[PDB]
Design a protein around this ligand. Structure first.
Ligand code: 1JH
Length: 559
C-alpha cells in the first residue's frame, strides 16, 4: 500500500521559522562562511513528501521466517514490567510538546491533577478501544547542515503527550531490554563509542580476510510496512506481560504504530500514514528489530559467510569473511536484492570495503591515533562538517538541546572536538561566567542534563585517559578535518592553539574543577605537558544508563 496519502493540506509551521545563521560575534570566530550554514524549514516539506510517498513492495521467504522464529525464541525469555503513571511522567522531557487537553510537560513531570487524570483516561481508552486510529501531528523538522557541492526537511509524526506517557507505561521496559535480549552483541545502542570501536575492531580481527559494508536503506521509515509492524508486535508479545500491558501493546499497534491520520499544526487533516512514525516510543527498537530481521535473512539468501551485524535503528553495518573480490561484489548485490524484496531498497548503492577505517556507519568510522607512550589507540570519529555547523548555530541562537556538548562527549578523542569544540565553548562559558550551569544534550536520542565542569571525568570514564593525550592522527583523518576547515572558513590549528592556551590559563587560575578542565582538556595545547593521572571522581561515575538502548523520537528524558 501507499506509505502516505495526502489530502492537499500543507505541512505548516507552528511559529516563525529561522533558516539562516545569524551574523553573530561569537559564531563568527568559529566559522566564517555563515552563508553555507542553514536550517531546514517547512518550506521544503513538499520536496520531502514526494520522496517518502510511494507504494511498497514486499515478498517474504523462508529465510525471513526462519530468522523471525529465532528472534521470537529469544524474546520469549523476557519479562517486561509496566511502568506506573508516576514513573512514565518522570521520563518526560521538560521541553516535550504540550498536550492539547489543557496541560504541558511541566504539569506531567509535576504529577499535576489535570495531567495525571487525562493520562489515565487515555490509558483506559487504550484498554477498551482496540481500533480507533489515534490522531498524530505532522511537522517539518528543523535541522542544521552545511550546503553541499540542499536537504529538504525531515517529517516528524507524533501523538499527543497523553498518549506518549501511556506508551512509556506499556513499552518503556520492553524497548529498553528486549533488543539486547534478541540481538545480543549486534544491538548497537548497548555500546559506548569506545565499546563500539572495540566491538568493530575485534569483529574485524576475528575474520581471516575481512570484508565489510554499510547499508543505507532509502527512507527506511517509509519502507516499514503494516506487516513489519505487526511482525514487530508479535516479537513483543513473546514477553511475559501484565494483562493491561498486553492489551495496550495490541491497541497501540493497530491504532498508532501501523499508521493513522495526519493533522498539521493548524488542525487540518493532512492525510494518512501507513508506515513508521518517527515520533513514537517504539521507533528505535522497532527499526532496529526490523533492520536486523531483514538483513540477517538477506545475508543467508546472499550466501555471505560468517556475518556479524551491528544495528542502530535503520543504520546497518555488516562484517563478514571474504570469498574474494568478484564473489564479494556478487554476494553484496544478491544481498541488496534480498533486502529489496523485503521492502528495504537501498538509497546509496552498497560497496564492499576491505579497510575498516573507510567504513562509515552511524555517520561515523573507526580511526587510529597515538597516546603519549606512542601506542596505537583506536577511537570513533566522523566528518566534522555537520557538528561544526550546528555548534555555530547553537552559539548564535538558544537551542533546547546542545548538540555541541553531545558531540564533545561522544567524540572527545577526535582531533576536531578537542581543537575546536572544547576550545570554542570553554572560552565562551568562561567569559559569560557559566561553567557551573548544567545544559541538556542527547545521547542515543535520550535527553540528559550535564554540567560542563564534569567533562573531564565523563571523558576519562568513557574514553580513558588517552583521550587527553592522543596525537599523530591518520593522514586520512587529518586531510578530512583540514578540508572541512577550509570549506566552512574555520580558523587554522595555530589560532585554536593560541585560544586554547589562553582558555587553559584562565581555567587553571580558577582552581577546582575548572582547573581540572584546564589541565586535561587542554594539555594538547602546551609544550610543557602535565602528568595526567586518574581523576578520582571518574571512578565514582554511574554512566551505565547512558548506553542501554536507543530512544530517538521516543520523547525520553533521563534525570
Ligand atoms: C587535539 C590536538 C592534539 C595534538 C596536536 S599537535 O599540535 O600536538 N600535533 C598535530 C598538529 C597538526 C596536525 O594536523 C592538523 C591539520 C589541520 C588542522 C588540525 C590538525 C596533526 C597533529 C597530530 O597530532 O596528528 C594538536 C591538536
Amino acid at each position: 500500500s501507499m506509505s502516505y496519502t495526502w489530502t492537499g493540506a500543507l505541512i505548516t509551521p507552528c511559529a516563525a521559522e529561522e533558516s539562516k545563521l545569524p551574523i553573530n560575534p561569537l559564531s563568527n570566530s568559529l566559522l566564517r562562511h555563515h552563508n553555507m550554514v542553514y536550517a531546514t524549514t517547512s518550506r521544503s516539506a513538499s520536496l520531502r513528501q514526494k520522496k517518502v510517498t510511494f507504494d511498497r513492495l514486499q515478498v517474504l521467504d523462508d529465510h525471513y521466517r526462519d530468522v523471525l522464529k529465532e528472534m521470537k525464541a529469544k524474546a520469549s525469555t523476557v519479562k517486561a514490567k509496566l511502568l506506573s503513571i508516576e514513573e512514565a511522567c518522570k521520563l518526560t522531557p521538560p521541553h516535550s510538546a504540550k498536550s492539547k487537553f489543557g496541560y504541558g510537560a511541566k504539569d506531567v513531570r509535576n504529577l499535576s491533577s489535570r495531567a495525571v487524570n487525562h493520562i489515565r483516561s487515555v490509558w483506559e481508552d487504550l484498554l477498551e478501544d482496540t481500533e480507533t486510529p489515534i490522531d498524530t501531528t505532522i511537522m517539518a523538522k528543523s535541522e542544521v547542515f552545511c550546503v553541499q557541492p540542499r536537504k529538504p526537511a525531515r517529517l516528524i509524526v507524533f501523538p499527543d503527550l497523553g498518549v506518549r506517557v501511556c506508551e512509556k507505561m506499556a513499552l518503556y521496559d520492553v524497548v529498553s531490554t528486549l533488543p539486547q535480549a534478541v540481538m545480543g552483541s549486534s544491538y548497537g545502542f548497548q555500546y559506548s563509542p569506545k565499546q563500539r570501536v572495540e566491538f568493530l575492531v575485534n569483529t574485524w580481527k576475528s575474520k581471516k580476510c575481512p570484508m565489510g559494508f554499510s547499508y543505507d536503506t532509502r527512507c527506511f521509515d517509509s519502507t516499514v510496512t503494516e506487516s513489519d509492524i505487526r511482525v514487530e508486535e508479535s516479537i513483543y508479545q513473546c514477553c511475559d506481560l501484565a494483562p493491561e500491558a498486553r492489551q495496550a501493546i495490541r491497541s497501540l499497534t493497530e491504532r498508532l504504530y501501523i499508521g493513522g491520520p495526519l493533522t498539521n499544526s493548524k488542525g487540518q487533516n493532512c492525510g494518512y500514514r501507513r508506515c513508521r512514525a518517527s515520533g513514537v516510543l517504539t521507533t528505535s527498537c522497532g527499526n532496529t528489530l526490523t533492520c536486523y530481521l531483514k538483513a540477517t535473512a538477506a545475508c543467508r539468501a546472499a550466501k555471505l559467510q560468517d556475518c556479524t551485524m551491528l544495528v542502530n535503528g535503520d543504520d546497518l553495518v555488516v562484517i563478514c569473511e571474504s570469498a574474494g573480490t568478484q564473489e564479494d561484489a556478487a554476494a553484496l548485490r544478491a544481498f541488496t536484492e534480498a533486502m529489496t524484496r523485503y521492502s528495504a531498497p537501498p538509497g546509496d548503492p552498497p560497496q564492499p570495503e576491505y579497510d575498516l577505517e573507510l567504513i562509515t556507519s552511524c555517520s561515523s568510522n573507526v580511526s587510529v591515533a597515538h597516546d603519549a607512550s606512542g601506542k596505537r589507540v583506536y577511537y570513533l570519529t566522523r566528518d566534522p562538517t555537520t557538528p561544526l555547523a550546528r555548534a555555530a548555530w547553537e552559539t548564535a541562537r538558544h537551542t533546547p538541546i546542545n548538540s555541541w556538548l553531545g558531540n564533545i562527549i561522544m567524540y572527545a578523542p577526535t582531533l576536531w572536538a578537542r581543537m575546536i569544540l572544547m576550545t570554542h565553548f570553554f572560552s565562551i562559558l568562561l567569559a559569560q561566567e557559566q561553567l557551573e550551569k548544567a545544559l541538556d544534550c542527547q545521547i542515543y536520542g535520550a535527553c540528559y542534563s550535564i554540567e560542563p565542569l564534569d567533562l573531564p571525568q565523563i571523558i576519562e570514564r568513557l574514553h580513558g585517559l588517552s583521550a587527553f593525550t592522543l596525537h599523530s592522527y591518520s593522514p586520512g583523518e587529518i586531510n578530512r578535518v583540514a578540508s572541512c576547515l577550509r570549506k566552512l572558513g574555520v580558523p587554522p590549528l595555530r589560532t585554536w592553539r593560541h585560544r586554547a592556551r589562553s582558555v587553559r590559563a584562565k581555567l587553571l587560575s580558577q582552581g577546582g574543577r575548572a582547573a581540572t578542565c584546564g589541565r586535561y582538556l587542554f594539555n594538547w595545547a602546551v609544550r610543557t605537558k602535565l602528568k595526567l593521572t586518574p581523576i578520582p571522581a571518574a571512578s565514582q561515575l554511574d554512566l551505565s544508563g547512558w548506553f542501554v538502548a536507543g530512544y530517538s523520537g521516543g520523547d525520553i528524558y533521563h534525570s
